[model samples]
Target: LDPGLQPGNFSADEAGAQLFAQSYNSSAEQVLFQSVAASWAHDTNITAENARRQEEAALLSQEFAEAWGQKAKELYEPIWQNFTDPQLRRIIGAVRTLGSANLPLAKRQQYNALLSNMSRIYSTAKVCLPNKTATCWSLDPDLTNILASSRSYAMLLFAWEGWHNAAGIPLKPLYEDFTALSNEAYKQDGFTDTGAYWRSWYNSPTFEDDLEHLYQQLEPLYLNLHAFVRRALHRRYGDRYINLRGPIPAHLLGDMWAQSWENIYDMVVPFPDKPNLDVTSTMLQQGWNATHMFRVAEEFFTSLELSPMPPEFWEGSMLEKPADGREVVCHASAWDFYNRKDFRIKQCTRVTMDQLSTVHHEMGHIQYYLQYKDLPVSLRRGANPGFHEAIGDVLALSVSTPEHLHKIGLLDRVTNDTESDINYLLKMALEKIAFLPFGYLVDQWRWGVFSGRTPPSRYNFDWWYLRTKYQGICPPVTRNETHFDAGAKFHVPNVTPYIRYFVSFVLQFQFHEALCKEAGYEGPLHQCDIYRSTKAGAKLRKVLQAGSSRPWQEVLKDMVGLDALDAQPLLKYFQLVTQWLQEQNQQNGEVLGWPEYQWHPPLPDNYPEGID
Candidate 1:
């Protein structure tokens, strides 16, 4: 069988009948990736003269992917039998379990078409702002800076809506196609739909329950934080834009998308004069550019002796958008070149504080690739997808800390006292805590649609319903079926898996706490930075080196001293903020667990609650 195709007949009906009675074990044979996988990172040759031929090229390329995926299935089909070789069984399962791993031929083609359309649309799409000097925003990282500091609330609304238009409005039909095709493909793989397939990567039957339990654990904290931010905004924007007792409008959050609120920390900022860390200005004032920002990110790893990224990574990466004006994908991704040593990040890096944290996050994946490059192709993957994503953000948690900033000479030495601690907690919560439900809800919505629980006709309605229910967020204006607002997110149209981010948000803290312990830390978990600790570095490398050689649970167990996923560590890490926010909410006359209508006594502490 051609090696690229996954090896299996995954129909639920194909089970039993001596399928498991036979003994066929395919070893590590297809160590190479197919030529077509390159299209995933880059674009087709954009020459109209060769247009038909190029279209044919994509067709043949997709055809190859389909065959390779099937062959992969066939190679591992024998190992599913009642075989006794433990090591071989491990290998077979490792090979089978992948992100978007198994696909029928037509599904492969559809998946390819969907991803290609998204990449092209995102890269070329630009929002025009005639009043601004640049007159155009590419919906890239640069827009982040404007949204953060633009004092004109009207301008914020205009630019934020424009960016969303660029990402979503033109691509609604593609999103519907993606939704339908994805459901069809995942069903072929013995799953109810694509959502089930993605959840299966969690490698547990209790995955949904675990996610629900986490949300319950976090709800009150979310409510408290949300209430605090709402009152602060009401104080600033007045009752007109900021409703004290209700959800905040998406655009008013000071982000083009409401996914993160880190940028608008200034509007509701606790200390007006005392600056929140601004490494972006410091970098530029010191003659640093976007490339310099990445070097700073790379230093965090090298300082800990965790990873020394080879020169090739810098040279191969697309650090900033091309000046040649070539259409390119700039969605900030770290590519392993289909499980090879050739790893690079594609980003439109900018001179901003958020970029500093993002740099650390992407570099986390880069270092992960560097550490495990020698492993076999199939095995050179994360313990789980979340583990991989969390690694970078875990380190970024430190990179954005005031203590680390002062150490790096970006700010004066600041004491980690109650005032500073609360500031740090609130800033972190605005993004991380706000993100908890959002990261969970996207997949939740998709899974519902894929399973036919959420009907396609109500796609827009369901999207907003979850947004209101989970995030306590609403659109800036009334939305309807005319717009595929969900498609505004890069993940939905691209069919990229998103729940990994939600899982990572939890695991990173667990990792951060464990690493702090390894480094002999005695203070708060949020304050502990493992930057220069070789002991912590050694512990991280030990787990990173495992790649996917062991089950994620086993790896997590060995690393953090737990055999199952839990958000308790995250709660412990953020204990200071949780308590502080609850007290602050009471003083502001805002109830801490949702609005009064949604509040309950002995609520999340009971942790028995579920969102119907």
Candidate 2:
């Protein structure tokens, strides 16, 4: 849970004075904490009753954020006067002050109450059709598994609609409640709205303009890919329901909710020839397990001259579910205890390609925490949030490359054939290209709602509208406001800001190309492998070491030769695949461009205000 949601009672003087009296160091933090790290650490231990107690403990105190704020207020003038070098960037105190100034008792309590309820509801909630099953399944593996592979459309629809709309109906009031409280809390911090407040976290005055520009750059690629996928789906499924140039059914995307199409790659991969390059399968076939999977992930980094993880990382990480059969947070994440080397990944890992890939991604966060450990707390974070998430994923992309797979002996021989390239590109496109618009729309919808452009009454309607507008997707079953389907995504209800993912999707390609450039590779950019290149490692180290100490633009410009995010290189790299896709579609004569509003709104714009 966010500490900002924990309420505290203090006059600015008491907290400020205590803050001013201390020195904070790696070993000796003077400020008393509940002694638990916020975010992943505290929330992972959540139970409905303990979750309540944690909030109560937080609400009963106010000194920490306040003390930090006071310390910032006290230190600001001196730092301003003392620094001779014209550095006008963010300092430790400024960040704390901004955090502390927002939470008055009433607003803080509201924030705490929302988060507390979210934790309780998230942990306890279960769903199933009323008459179908006596027991309701939890949302994670249970519902998600059935949705992905179940061929029965009836069961699939039940699982999908039940998971999205079940708790969402009972908790519908919480959406508006959280929004109003969050907006007020942020506005008190001197922002126009909560979304705008989040936008300010990036060190840019032109954040909105840059974001719009990013969308503009990505739109062509999205539209073309969307058209290609639509045609492919139409060919497989008949035009009676899956019409040509119309929105494809969402549930058919292989995932239960159709949020990401990566899981659906098997259904639409272009090449008829299947390569025997399933590394995860081969490992499992040879009796390998999650331990071996993680070791391979570690090797990918060490081979690239990145730091080898310490003995403690492997020892401390929660790699699998506990043997006790007790409840625990199942989300996969890397955690840092801020002790320089105290980092671990909390995940219930399994033996799948996706899980294997995720091991590498979570380790990316761990490695990052290690790299910048010596920096002061304020600076020991990603230059931007996206940068942190992008590092491991970008590397995973390279590691999964066919060339890399062969080089690592996962493949018997390198095919280096046209079909091989096309197949690889198609898989990547299903994941990378198909995911781009979904990433964009999550925050786009949130920003719209937070900005009041999408009023509360239009919540469910506008959710679908943006999904259609950006993702070329349609619900398998018709939807309306009785379901706040957007809340089904864990991020929205959990209140985790999402634009970082959107930014990461764009930035990963840029980082990939730059690493390739540093590694001194030739031939196709997509096939470039920097695995053991000290030079490439050095370039990455430069950015990793700086942490949040430098502006993201400055850091990005140094690393990638551009101060702005761009998708041009990604487009250029996929040029061959694009041409092949277009030519393949031409043989079938599938025209693309869906008719607007594939389904009409079942409810009026002034929806919930009038109806039950």
Q: Which ten residues in a row have the lowest lDDT in candidate 1?
A: 600-609
For residues 162-223, what per-residue lDDT tens digits would candidate 1 score against the true structure? Answer: 67667767777677777677676556566787788778778898988888888899888888
The Cα local distance difference test for each model comes to: 0.70, 0.70
lDDT of 2 by residue, 262-362 (tens): 65566667765566544666666667677877888888888878887888878877787666745666668777766565677888776766677788888
Off by over 4 Å in 2: 1-45, 56-62, 74-89, 96-101, 129-132, 276-280, 407-409, 600-612
lDDT score, candidate 1: 0.70
Clashes of 2: 2
Taking all chains together, each candidate's TM-score versus the true structure is: 0.86, 0.87
